[PDB]
Design a protein around this ligand. Structure first.
Ligand code: CYC
Ligand code: CYC
Ligand code: CYC
Ligand code: CYC
Ligand code: CYC
Ligand code: CYC
Ligand code: CYC
Ligand code: CYC
Ligand code: CYC
Ligand code: CYC
Ligand code: CYC
Ligand code: CYC
Lengths: 172, 162, 162, 172, 172, 162, 162, 172
């Protein structure tokens, strides 16, 4: 797996070059936003249950057949499985957020997940919708200004949203 | 690639769990030192040509025969002097890789592995490159924790030669 | 016991080697966090009595039947209210232990182990103690990173009950 | 093993009480010396060869028969084992220096070391001598005011010296 | 594997015949040149690093893209692998030289090596060029008249060159 | 084929290394003895017909019934005498193979393996071939180390019959 | 210890059999080489002092900083120069051991084992001793096969440092 | 095990000195007797059956009850084991003769042989007798001036006789 620094270094080693001032500036930006990155990851983690719950609720209001008899999320077994999947994707999103690179999320989670769902009969589009509602809930929790030093986290937030959109597209 | 961040993420993933508080404490320790590490990487990359040329000349003054004796493994002509500066550039470049990544990973993968076979085959004394690194360490111009970071990864490359 | 420092030393000793720069980076992350951790531990220890009594009262207000129903497991009389405050004191005491140690070690070893069957045997509802920990979290009077350190371990005990 | 904080926490758990102000003060002092503790460990580690060499040199100047034919440190096999023993003891002293507690040093290195040394016929007094020489060489390296922020490290140095004295007394 | 004597004996056993005077003379020639054979093998062995170095240098001057970014011999991993291959082929050439028969070189080295290179993306023609420069360097070291009793080694040298040409053709 | 040279090369190859100094010392010992070994192989090959016919007649004089008694395993007629000379030619031929190769390999592979089954099935007394070999050893005409080499491989074939 | 003779005897005993003609061929190769080996060992032992002092001086001329820089690991003073000559004496002494034994056994057991960590601990550059061995190889005053035997084991020690 | 040269080298390494001229002279003498040493080993090996037979014959002429009903060498089982013991002791004497040192003979054959022989109830005195008979038969075969270059082998024969006396005394 790669983080933001290891990705830049691997590209420079292939070119056989020192890092440019562009790449040195970009990574200095990542380092200065490191504390915001920790706050983002720690807030998504401490509130994983809330993020999954808000996402599932909005998904089940939008698609009520999921929680009705015959729905893919009906019964205790399928509901627990569905919630486990939501927490799994969130977990790998927090990996990519701390790392600054989606490599861990792409390799150890999204790669082949679509095919896994189409084989199990799980609605990939519904999962992609659920992942999108996870994004909105996580962003709202990450951007909460209470109990935290004020500042601009918009670049980080765009990054986190990109990891969620990546997860949604891999199953839609 | 092995970095302190990828190590912590891999530890959490193998146990199928979110990152713990201790793992985030460790990642913070890397982010704290990363400002001084990035300072060292910037100074070494900007002064690359001056440090490389100074390290080469430091070797020529310490081992005078390397500019005098005939032989393809020596820098007694233009071709050998270009090869020597190139090699020192290789060392410093990969050292900046490690400072940027926050660990010895790039040095282990891109430089140290096979280094002893390369030096033995082409009859390049490792003491030459120890001396070039000792000059860069003594003359990078850094201070404080940026100097400490640069020193730890230069000392790492020195120890790999010893 | 399992602390970030003894964890780093154990990993180094297992490979029979000195501590690496990465392990020293992780220990620095702990030593940086330890200032906020100590402030939180000092605050919770000083205001122990007021926090304990306020937590018990918050549980009584939230679940009024705990002060109305008879039965040894409830807090209708003076013996039950004193047992409740003793329990909440046990929780906060071991939470400060973990804040001092910089990890969940004390909470895992001194509190959570066997907690579920203690509560089950004596008919103590985990949601009572979750409410008491929620009060302590909202009334410790901390800000910044000391509040975050306290909240990390208070939430850890809350999650162990859920 | 225990660090400085786990030892106090374990004793307070035995007593079943909160930590007193005296214990909080002592552990807060250890925290304020954290960057100094890291400097001592980092300097003792990156100069480990210099420390072992300086101690071995002075030991072989005082007891020259150790590197003479018949000596317990003569031949390549015994000299390398002597240097390995020096490195190991210094390694465990740095463990204790980081932990702020000698539990790891006593449990995993010093316990039963005199009995083994007596079995292999290694002069335990000469080992204790070389250990005391490491202390002098290690402390001189730690106390070097070059390239470091000026400040008082006497408490830390006294603690490190106590760890070396513990090792020396364990084989003397 | 076969040496020169075992090869002749295996052909005679299939024919069921005593060795002819031609074969007896040929093998007596090999035995009289045995000391030169040892000198040749010992000189290639003692100078394996020099032979590989001279060959690689001439190959990298002729094909400089090999040691530039993206070259098949760029980076430490590919350079060490390339040098290891050169030493391997030289090692098997010294086997065939001491044996007086290319059987060991053909069976345990060259057989299927072409296919191995085409699968790994290694330029077989470049390897064949490198092997040819090994030949010239080894011959020069073998034919060095200094520090050795003067005499004609031209038959041996032709044999050694044939083993190198055999190695080059198996990958070109 | 197993020869002293192929044994040394196989030893070096299994450890993936060049030939050591001790292996070259051993190969030299074979090359030193090879001059006397080649002398023996030449003398035995040139005098092949005379040695074969003499060995056969030596057997007929030592075991007189082999030319008198009727039976297909005996040499009392022209056919049996041709078969006997052929067999002795086989022994001597393979003995020259071993002298040429420098070891007992050819004798092991081309003669000894299955020899006892052949002799038992066709009722050929091994003592006959021991006597023919004893004659060739006593009458090859060699001296010095060429005789010692011839003797060791003739004695090897004799021991295989005993 | 591992010598060509004890190696041959060990192989024979493992199979519980007398020594074969091939093993006796290998031992003869050693006994032939042993004459040159003994002459080389006699020469290096007799001229030990002149060879040692000349080797140390060749290192000082080649790497002048070894006599100029201060530090216990260098040879600026009389103590350092005497330590250097003692070391070079150790190398040559064990080299004559190997010449007597007819194999690398003594060099592997008495010198190379642990040599790398001895040099690393006391900051002794391997290229110093390579130069000293290069001088001894070019100044032992031997010719023919005695020179080749000496050069074989001197180069063996040189390769152990590279 | 040690040969003649390893024993001197190991003692000089213990003393940490170069080999003296006396040691160089003694080992050079062993080298000049190398071809004679090979003749002794080759003659003792290729005549091993004759040696064991001659010694066994004379032993059974002197102690005829050994091959009489009740004897320790009577029956096929005990006679074959007796001859096997003879061959083994002669085999290890040839090992020592080649090595020029009795270390292999003492360590791997003679050590504890009397104790086993006493356990199996084998007359150790009769074994020592037969061993002395092998010495006479082996030395007569070694000293045979037929088909060999004339020269003095008395030192070698005395050394071989000492090896046989060591074996005889180890069971007597
Ligand atoms: C974006 C998510 C929001 C935001 C973040 C923000 N925080 C600071 C301040 C700090 N955040 C931390 C976080 C940590 N350090 C650790 O070691 C750990 C895990 C153990 C964490 C979670 C710290 C130490 C600080 C500094 C102390 C402080 O409270 O200020 C800032 C400004 C300072 C900076 O950028 O470094 C910002 C912007 N603030 C918002 O408004 C966003 C919603
Ligand atoms: C062809 C490569 C060059 C050449 C060779 C050459 N050498 C001799 C002399 C000798 N070479 C050896 C070699 C060895 N014997 C061993 O046991 C070992 C390994 C341990 C080796 C390497 C020996 C013993 C001799 C004899 C002593 C001497 O130095 O003369 C000759 C002439 C004698 C002969 O052919 O046997 C030749 C031709 N000489 C050249 O000019 C070629 C460049
Ligand atoms: C929830 C929003 C939706 C949903 C999910 C659902 N999944 C299953 C079964 C599985 N889910 C996975 C996914 C992963 N397991 C991993 O280890 C990883 C990477 C770390 C991933 C991405 C897998 C492998 C399965 C297979 C079986 C299992 O339970 O593990 C179910 C149950 C299917 C059934 O018929 O029992 C469900 C319900 N269903 C919905 O309706 C939501 C849209
Ligand atoms: C300079 C300190 C001294 C010196 C240098 C020198 N080097 C060569 C040739 C080579 N250097 C390398 C090293 C590397 N290649 C890699 O990919 C890496 C990892 C990043 C390293 C460390 C190699 C492989 C070679 C040989 C192949 C090549 O040309 O690239 C020479 C010429 C040697 C020759 O035989 O051609 C020289 C002179 N020599 C001195 O005297 C300087 C003091
Ligand atoms: C307070 C939130 C509610 C409450 C408290 C209550 N507890 C008891 C009795 C017990 N509490 C414990 C808990 C622990 N003992 C330990 O050693 C540890 C580890 C730190 C813990 C967490 C135990 C073991 C008991 C029973 C044994 C004892 O008394 O010590 C009572 C009385 C119940 C009884 O049957 O005796 C009460 C009332 N009840 C409420 O209604 C409060 C809301
Ligand atoms: C050097 C300062 C002195 C000295 C040392 C010496 N020791 C040996 C043998 C051993 N030393 C140890 C010690 C340890 N091994 C561990 O893993 C640990 C930490 C848990 C320790 C403390 C051991 C176990 C041995 C025996 C096994 C081994 O050798 O590895 C020797 C060699 C003795 C010999 O060869 O017979 C020496 C020389 N001797 C001196 O004279 C110095 C004063
Ligand atoms: C006592 C041994 C000597 C001494 C130490 C000292 N240091 C400071 C300040 C710092 N020391 C460090 C070192 C590290 N931080 C890490 O994370 C790591 C490993 C990765 C190390 C090695 C740092 C970062 C600082 C802060 C920045 C700075 O350079 O000052 C002080 C001042 C008080 C304090 O504790 O900060 C002191 C006294 N100085 C001496 O004179 C003693 C000999
Ligand atoms: C060097 C002149 C050229 C070159 C070589 C190169 N090879 C690899 C990889 C391999 N080489 C072999 C060859 C052998 N291994 C054996 O055991 C034997 C017989 C004893 C032979 C002949 C093999 C098997 C490999 C496979 C992988 C490995 O490293 O072992 C590389 C690296 C390829 C990569 O992409 O990593 C290289 C570079 N490359 C050049 O440019 C030169 C022309
Ligand atoms: C001569 C010493 C005595 C003798 C010889 C004799 N042999 C036969 C027939 C055979 N001899 C062999 C032996 C071999 N065949 C092989 O391939 C090899 C390995 C090289 C050997 C050693 C065999 C197989 C036969 C039978 C098959 C054949 O005819 O080739 C005879 C005739 C026996 C018969 O029954 O036909 C004789 C007479 N007999 C004497 O009396 C001589 C003293
Ligand atoms: C000479 C080429 C350079 C040089 C020499 C030098 N050596 C020391 C100290 C030591 N040398 C050894 C080597 C060995 N001891 C053994 O038992 C063996 C096996 C045979 C070897 C190879 C050792 C162990 C030491 C340290 C212990 C001791 O003194 O015996 C010094 C002094 C270094 C010190 O720190 O005391 C020197 C100067 N240095 C140069 O500059 C010369 C070019
Ligand atoms: C014959 C000269 C005398 C004699 C010998 C005899 N021995 C046995 C039994 C044994 N002999 C040995 C000796 C060795 N085995 C080895 O591997 C080695 C070298 C390491 C030696 C020296 C052993 C081990 C045995 C017991 C196991 C076995 O039989 O193989 C017998 C038979 C005793 C019996 O059957 O009870 C005999 C006859 N006895 C005489 O009378 C002769 C004087
Ligand atoms: C003492 C036992 C008797 C004796 C021996 C003797 N031999 C020579 C000469 C030689 N002996 C050999 C023998 C071998 N070389 C080998 O490689 C092998 C095994 C494969 C053997 C068995 C050789 C080759 C020679 C040289 C050529 C020759 O035949 O002379 C001498 C003369 C002095 C010398 O050491 O060379 C002697 C004395 N002669 C006796 O009279 C003793 C009874």
């Amino acid at each position: 797996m790669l983080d933001a620094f290891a990705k830049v270094v691997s590209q420079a080693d292939t070119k056989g070059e020192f890092l440019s001032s562009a790449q040195l500036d970009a990574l200095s930006n990542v380092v200065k936003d490191g504390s915001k990155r920790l706050d983002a990851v720690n807030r998504m983690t401490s509130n994983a249950s809330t993020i999954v719950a808000n996402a599932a609720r909005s998904l089940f209001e939008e698609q009520p057949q999921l929680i009705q008899p015959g729905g893919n999320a009906y019964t205790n077994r399928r509901m627990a499985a569905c919630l486990r999947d939501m927490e799994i994707i969130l977990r790998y999103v927090t990996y990519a957020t701390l790392a600054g690179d989606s490599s861990v999320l792409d390799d150890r989670c999204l790669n082949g997940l679509r095919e896994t769902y189409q084989a199990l009969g799980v609605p990939g589009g519904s999962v992609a919708a659920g992942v999108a509602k996870m994004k909105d809930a996580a962003i709202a929790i990450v951007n909460d200004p209470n109990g935290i030093t004020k500042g601009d986290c918009s670049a980080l937030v765009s990054e986190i949203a990109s990891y969620f959109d990546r997860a949604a597209a891999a199953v839609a | 690639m092995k970095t302190p961040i990828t190590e912590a993420i891999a530890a959490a993933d193998t146990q199928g769990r979110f990152l713990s508080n201790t793992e985030l404490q460790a990642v913070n320790g890397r982010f704290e030192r990363a400002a001084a590490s990035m300072e060292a990487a910037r100074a070494l990359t900007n002064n690359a040509q001056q440090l490389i040329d100074g390290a080469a000349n430091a070797v020529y003054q310490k081992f005078p025969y390397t500019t005098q004796m005939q032989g393809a493994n020596f820098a007694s002509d233009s071709r050998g002097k270009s090869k020597c500066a190139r090699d020192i550039g290789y060392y410093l470049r990969i050292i900046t890789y490690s400072l940027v990544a926050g660990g010895t990973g790039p040095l282990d993968e891109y430089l140290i592995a096979g280094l002893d076979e390369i030096n033995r085959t082409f009859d390049l004394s490792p003491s030459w490159y120890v001396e070039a690194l000792k000059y860069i360490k003594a003359n990078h111009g850094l201070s404080g924790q940026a100097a400490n970071e640069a020193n730890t990864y230069i000392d790492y490359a020195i120890n790999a030669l010893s």
